[PDB]
Amino acid sequence: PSVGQDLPPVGGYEPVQWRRNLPARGFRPLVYLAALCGICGYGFYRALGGIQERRELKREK
């Protein structure tokens, strides 16, 4: 017979995840490039603006 055996439930078990769950994420890449060149261009602006002022302070000195 069977009395105290470790047996499954009557409705079975809820299904598990066995398939790949690596969801592609991120923006599309060209946005990351457009933020890159935009950050670069803003930094070049801010720096080359800081060079021309150093040029004038030197003219004063």
């Binding site: 801010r46 603006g49 800081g50 002022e53 150093r54 004038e56 302070l57 003219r59 004063e60």
Partner: protein, 171 residues
């Protein structure tokens, strides 16, 4: 010229000037007040400095012995400038050059005190700062309203004075 190399002992000379060369007072002002007063001096000693360098050029080697009169007049013009400053605009001058000493003698860190000094000396001595060689288009850096480069720490006394002077309308 170059600097000393590998060894060098300072050595003075306890002698006096020849009797045929008269006597002249020395400026006796150090690096910082002198750099503050550079522009007011140049605005007033321009012909004298130019005549000095011209007679040095014409002499062609004997400048150290032929240009003494011209260097003497230059030194006296300078002394008159600094005496006018200390008599009249002392505290503002002290604000400027102490604000400088607490930096690397970068003039950018002292613009407030520089403003008070230019105003006072222009009202009293009639001497204004001017950077030449510029076009009417270029904006001189000491009058820019929001410059890119700002000091690490705006000086305290300078800031209190600038605010009180805007409240009093002196600027």
């Amino acid at each position: 010229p170059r600097e000393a190399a590998a060894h060098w002992v300072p050595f003075e000379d306890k002698a006096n000037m020849p009797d045929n060369v008269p006597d002249v007072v020395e400026v006796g002002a150090t690096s910082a007040p002198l750099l503050s007063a550079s522009y007011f001096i140049g605005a007033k000693c321009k012909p004298y400095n130019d005549d000095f360098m011209l007679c040095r050029e014409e002499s062609q080697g004997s400048g150290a012995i032929d240009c003494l009169k011209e260097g003497r007049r230059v030194t006296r013009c300078a002394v008159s400038v600094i005496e006018d400053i200390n008599k009249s605009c002392l505290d503002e001058f002290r604000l400027h050059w102490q604000c400088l000493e607490q930096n690397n003698h970068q003039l950018s860190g002292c613009r407030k005190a520089e403003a008070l000094l230019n105003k006072c000396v222009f009202t009293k001595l009639n001497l204004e700062k001017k950077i030449p060689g510029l076009r009417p288009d270029e904006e001189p850096v000491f009058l820019k309203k929001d410059p890119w480069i700002k000091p690490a720490v705006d000086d305290f006394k300078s800031v209190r004075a600038y605010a009180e002077a805007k409240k009093n309308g002196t600027l």
